[PDB]
Scaffold this motif. Structure first.
Motif, mmCIF file in Angstrom:
data_model
loop_
_atom_site.group_PDB
_atom_site.id
_atom_site.type_symbol
_atom_site.label_atom_id
_atom_site.label_comp_id
_atom_site.label_asym_id
_atom_site.label_seq_id
_atom_site.Cartn_x
_atom_site.Cartn_y
_atom_site.Cartn_z
ATOM 1 N N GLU A 12 34.135 64.647 21.452
ATOM 2 C CA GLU A 12 33.251 63.844 21.654
ATOM 3 C C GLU A 12 33.376 62.619 22.313
ATOM 4 O O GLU A 12 34.022 61.543 21.403
ATOM 5 C CB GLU A 12 32.592 63.708 20.040
ATOM 6 C CG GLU A 12 32.445 65.094 19.206
ATOM 7 C CD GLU A 12 31.987 64.783 17.896
ATOM 8 O OE1 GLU A 12 32.806 64.123 17.127
ATOM 9 O OE2 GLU A 12 31.064 65.168 17.664
ATOM 10 N N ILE A 13 33.473 62.677 23.553
ATOM 11 C CA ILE A 13 33.859 61.276 24.097
ATOM 12 C C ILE A 13 32.775 60.008 24.028
ATOM 13 O O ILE A 13 33.397 58.931 23.781
ATOM 14 C CB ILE A 13 34.074 61.429 25.654
ATOM 15 C CG1 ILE A 13 32.668 62.199 26.389
ATOM 16 C CG2 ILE A 13 35.058 62.195 25.814
ATOM 17 C CD1 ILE A 13 32.756 62.311 27.606
ATOM 18 N N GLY A 14 31.636 60.272 23.849
ATOM 19 C CA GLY A 14 30.847 59.251 23.546
ATOM 20 C C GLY A 14 29.479 59.448 24.204
ATOM 21 O O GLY A 14 28.446 58.701 24.256
ATOM 22 N N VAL A 15 29.396 60.593 25.005
ATOM 23 C CA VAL A 15 28.050 61.090 25.996
ATOM 24 C C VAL A 15 27.081 61.414 25.175
ATOM 25 O O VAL A 15 27.463 62.474 24.113
ATOM 26 C CB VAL A 15 28.517 61.950 26.924
ATOM 27 C CG1 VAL A 15 27.311 62.300 27.583
ATOM 28 C CG2 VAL A 15 29.201 61.146 27.893
ATOM 29 N N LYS A 16 26.079 60.923 24.976
ATOM 30 C CA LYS A 16 24.654 61.351 24.222
ATOM 31 C C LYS A 16 23.562 61.272 24.948
ATOM 32 O O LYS A 16 23.560 60.774 25.967
ATOM 33 C CB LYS A 16 24.728 60.263 22.902
ATOM 34 C CG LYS A 16 25.846 60.275 22.004
ATOM 35 C CD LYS A 16 25.527 59.142 20.852
ATOM 36 C CE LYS A 16 24.930 57.703 21.184
ATOM 37 N NZ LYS A 16 26.319 56.906 21.320
ATOM 38 N N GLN A 17 22.719 62.144 24.401
ATOM 39 C CA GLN A 17 21.230 62.350 25.204
ATOM 40 C C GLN A 17 20.528 61.076 25.205
ATOM 41 O O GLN A 17 20.430 60.193 24.012
ATOM 42 C CB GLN A 17 20.487 63.366 24.483
ATOM 43 C CG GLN A 17 21.161 64.660 24.323
ATOM 44 C CD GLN A 17 20.406 65.891 23.787
ATOM 45 O OE1 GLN A 17 19.217 65.567 23.705
ATOM 46 N NE2 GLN A 17 20.853 67.058 23.716
ATOM 47 N N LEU A 18 19.929 60.742 26.418
ATOM 48 C CA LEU A 18 19.564 59.253 26.307
ATOM 49 C C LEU A 18 17.929 59.341 25.722
ATOM 50 O O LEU A 18 17.461 60.300 25.960
ATOM 51 C CB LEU A 18 19.376 58.791 27.883
ATOM 52 C CG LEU A 18 20.687 59.016 28.658
ATOM 53 C CD1 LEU A 18 20.327 58.744 29.995
ATOM 54 C CD2 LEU A 18 21.577 57.781 28.056
ATOM 55 N N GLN A 19 17.659 58.284 25.055
ATOM 56 C CA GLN A 19 16.361 58.184 24.338
ATOM 57 C C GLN A 19 15.758 56.732 24.546
ATOM 58 O O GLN A 19 16.533 55.724 24.558
ATOM 59 C CB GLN A 19 16.605 58.590 22.998
ATOM 60 C CG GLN A 19 16.306 60.158 22.807
ATOM 61 C CD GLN A 19 16.241 60.687 21.335
ATOM 62 O OE1 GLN A 19 15.187 61.173 20.826
ATOM 63 N NE2 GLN A 19 17.143 60.121 20.675
ATOM 64 N N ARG A 20 14.525 56.636 24.091
ATOM 65 C CA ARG A 20 14.053 55.164 24.464
ATOM 66 C C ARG A 20 14.312 54.401 23.153
ATOM 67 O O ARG A 20 14.928 54.994 22.278
ATOM 68 C CB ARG A 20 12.233 55.677 24.174
ATOM 69 C CG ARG A 20 11.426 54.557 24.485
ATOM 70 C CD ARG A 20 10.064 55.024 24.683
ATOM 71 N NE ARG A 20 9.653 55.595 23.344
ATOM 72 C CZ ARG A 20 9.363 57.027 23.622
ATOM 73 N NH1 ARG A 20 9.270 57.757 24.473
ATOM 74 N NH2 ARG A 20 9.065 57.469 22.146
#
Lengths: 54, 369
Positions: A12-20
């Motif tokens: 879990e490098i730190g990439v997360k799904q982008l959100q408002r």
């Protein structure tokens, strides 16, 4: 040739799904009326004071 | 006596996300599977509805693989017939050029990663006013909810020159900089909230804006084999390399190898759409040929043409060349012109601009002697 048995590491490098970003709720007039339970059809009436002309 | 060959400068390797994850040797196929946390959706019912059922949402977490798939090396084969009497200092006549070569290769690797990403569309930069293009670039990357921090902006030489030439930065009244950093110097530091970094590795007329979590570089230093006489850990641009020299007796010439294992990844979203980086290309309006009308050395002379657009970018590789009179001289697809008979000829260079439409045309005259 050589054959090795290796796992399948998951990182879990730190990439997360982008959100408002939530902005709107803090701007709208929230909860001026609370006693919704004790009213017919769950509707609270609001009476606007009258004005007249001369 | 001090004259050095003109070489590029290194910017790109420090501006990408290098080694967020390291243990590549512990995974099958040398692929580490990065997982992304799951998000869900809510639902809306109606109060006092006779239907008393609920739609059950789901938590699905996606993933994508990062792989080591390239082995960048610089190999030198010099015989002992040249080691002891031609090279005077090893650590400055062979080692440093080799390290610089590997460093430039890594920079080219990263540059190919940046330019080769699947950008949906290109934002056009009007040379007259360039700020709207960059504000649009900032706006496109804000509709995808990309964070506003850790954003990098790398521009080519042409875009930097156009920024300096822009009256938005050149005129002090139009920018508020009552020192004209764009006039006294050619520098335009801050722009639309993004710190501009000049570079030559990327294409000269393009600029790239990317969040930190848009490109991933993974590096691994090959472990020095026990069966090698030499062995070191030379570092290039913060990336350690393995240097290995073996005195091969197959042709009595010792060989050296400076290498590293590299892997690249673009972080596409769960729907396979790339939204964490945008690219901008400088708009072009006309082209010309440097040197104007000229004459070859001989009847069978050869001259390499060079086409520059109004922005100054070398657009030779992106032009189609035709000869009005091929009987006297012809021109290759790469711009090189060869004369076959004495006399005049007219060469037409056509370049489709990077915005669509009828291609620009530049006509020159060549006098084959």
């Amino acid at each position: 040739a050589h054959i090795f048995v290796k796992p399948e590491l998951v990182a879990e490098i730190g990439v997360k799904q982008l959100q408002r970003e939530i902005v709107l709720p803090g701007l709208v007039w929230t909860n001026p009326l609370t006693d919704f339970g004790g009213s017919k059809n769950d509707t609270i009436t609001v009476r606007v004071p009258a004005i007249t002309t001369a | 006596i001090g004259v050095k060959q003109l070489q590029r400068e290194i910017v790109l390797p420090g501006l990408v996300w290098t080694n967020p994850l390291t243990d590549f040797g512990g995974s099958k196929n040398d692929t580490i599977t990065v997982r992304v946390p799951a998000i869900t959706t809510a639902n809306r019912r109606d109060l006092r509805d006779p239907d008393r059922t609920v739609i059950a949402s789901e938590l699905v977490e996606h993933s994508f693989g990062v792989t080591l798939d390239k082995h960048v090396y610089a190999a030198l084969k010099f015989t002992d017939e040249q080691r002891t009497l031609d090279i005077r200092d090893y650590t400055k006549q062979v080692l440093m050029p080799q390290v610089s070569a590997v460093a430039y290769e890594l920079e080219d690797y990263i540059a190919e990663l940046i330019e080769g990403a699947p950008y949906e569309e290109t934002i056009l930069i009007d040379p007259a006013d360039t700020v709207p293009a960059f504000i649009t670039a900032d706006q496109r990357m804000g509709e995808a909810n990309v964070p506003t921090d850790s954003r990098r902006l790398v521009v080519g030489s042409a875009v930097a020159a156009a920024l300096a030439k822009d009256k938005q930065f050149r005129h002090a009244d139009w920018s508020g900089d009552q020192a004209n950093a764009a006039l006294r110097e050619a520098h335009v530091g801050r722009l639309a909230g993004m710190n501009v970094i000049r570079s030559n590795a990327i294409a000269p007329d393009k600029a790239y804006l990317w969040h930190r979590t848009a490109f991933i570089l993974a590096y691994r230093t090959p472990v020095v084999p026990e069966g090698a006489k030499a062995g070191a850990s030379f570092s290039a641009n913060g990336v350690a390399l393995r240097w290995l020299a073996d005195y091969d007796y197959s042709q009595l010439g010792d060989r050296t190898l400076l290498d590293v294992f590299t892997g690249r990844k673009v972080v596409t979203e769960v729907d396979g759409s790339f939204v964490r980086a945008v690219e901008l290309q400088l708009q072009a309006s006309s082209i010309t040929i440097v040197g104007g009308a000229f004459a070859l050395a001989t009847t069978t002379g050869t001259k390499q043409l060079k086409v520059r657009d109004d922005n100054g970018t070398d657009v030779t590789a992106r032009c189609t060349f035709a000869s009005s009179a091929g009987t006297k001289a012809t021109v290759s697809a790469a711009g090189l012109v060869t004369g076959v008979a004495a006399g005049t000829a007219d060469i037409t260079a056509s370049y489709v601009p990077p915005q669509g439409g009828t291609a620009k045309t530049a006509t020159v005259t060549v006098t084959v002697p």
